[PDB]
Symmetry: D2
């Protein structure tokens, strides 16, 4: 399995997970965040449900998760601030626009990029 | 000058700046964050005002700031997720408990640590 | 393809490459180093040739190589000094004893670990 | 004190140290390397002795050194491979041409840059 981690873990983290799982046959996916959050984005769960996908029930901080369990932790970084995690394990970095607040169609645009990237990533 | 950067930039980032400036003679300080935030913590501005300190007017993302201007960017990291910045410049990491939400006296405890660390840091 | 990079690129880097290729069906491998080196270790080429493997002809610095070509750059780090490369791409870290100088059977022990790790890594 | 660490620790690491010490009043300096080396460069000790400076007696790997002792570890990185050390402490990165082998006057050129940088760095 792979781990999609972003900062607040409410949208992107959750999007990549759901899309990954709908495309991967053997690999599975989970998500985590650097900081706490109460709810998963409503725009996201709507957008995923519109695609027949259920987002994660509740954001889970990366602290409540033992990283070594994963075999590829993909990190969804900001425009210029990729967070590093405590693992000599394999980890990539995806610079993806933060849809938060922007709402509107920007979320869908973010969804698509994540999809183009997950699709490509699911090559292996 | 030094730059105190944390994720959301609402409390700690702001605390260290204000305390630093009240202790440093020649050096000055600024703060920035990895992600957007509308307001500076009310507990903080209260806590600083109680010490005769005005917190920053509004959180400024590290994106609206050209890092090279600084000479020591101290990064206030989480329990296990120190964010890295785009600079071959000097940067440290302070693992400081996130007071957010916890409110109560936890904030003051966080204030004290930041103070113990800023005081020490102001050695140079 | 995967890229095995170490500092001087004379032994381990070269070992992992040759073993990987002898085990991977679809993926291929290459190697590179942080600093220049004139010759590939004689102990290694002997040790690989003893296993029917030809080591790389000459060490190639990671500078003479465009990283983006690869899809997983595994970094063979020291006891406490994992070098980071200029890529938002996926990269792991293997703490492997430096056989250099130690010669004797230590090289073979290093060969075995790299093999245990490559074998495992070739899972995907 | 500050710590100047490079890969092999034979030239640059040693140059910065000696120059630093000849310029700093209160701060002191030491050097360390990522990998073992038997001798300190002869071009360097000549070059420093020509300036009335004695280079380090023998290269000391960063492993034989407890990092926390220092208060600013400057890392002399390559064209594209800055090594990271095991410390949440403050550390910078200097991209300095590797004089090794090039010999000739290139060493002096490297000496000068390090000097321009140490001079500047000794501001604090």
């Amino acid at each position: 399995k792979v781990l999609f981690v972003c900062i607040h873990n409410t949208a992107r983290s959750v999007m990549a997970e759901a899309l990954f799982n709908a495309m991967a046959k053997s690999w599975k996916a989970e998500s985590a965040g650097v900081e706490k959050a109460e709810r998963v984005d409503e725009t996201v769960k709507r957008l995923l449900a519109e695609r027949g996908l259920k987002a994660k029930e509740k954001p889970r901080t990366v602290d409540e998760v033992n990283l070594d369990d994963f075999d590829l932790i993909v990190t969804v970084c900001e425009e210029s601030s990729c967070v590093v995690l405590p693992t000599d394990k394999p980890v990539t970095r995806w610079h993806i626009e933060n849809p938060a607040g922007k709402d509107e169609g920007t979320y869908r645009r973010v969804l698509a990029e994540i999809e183009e990237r997950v699709k490509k990533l699911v090559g292996e």
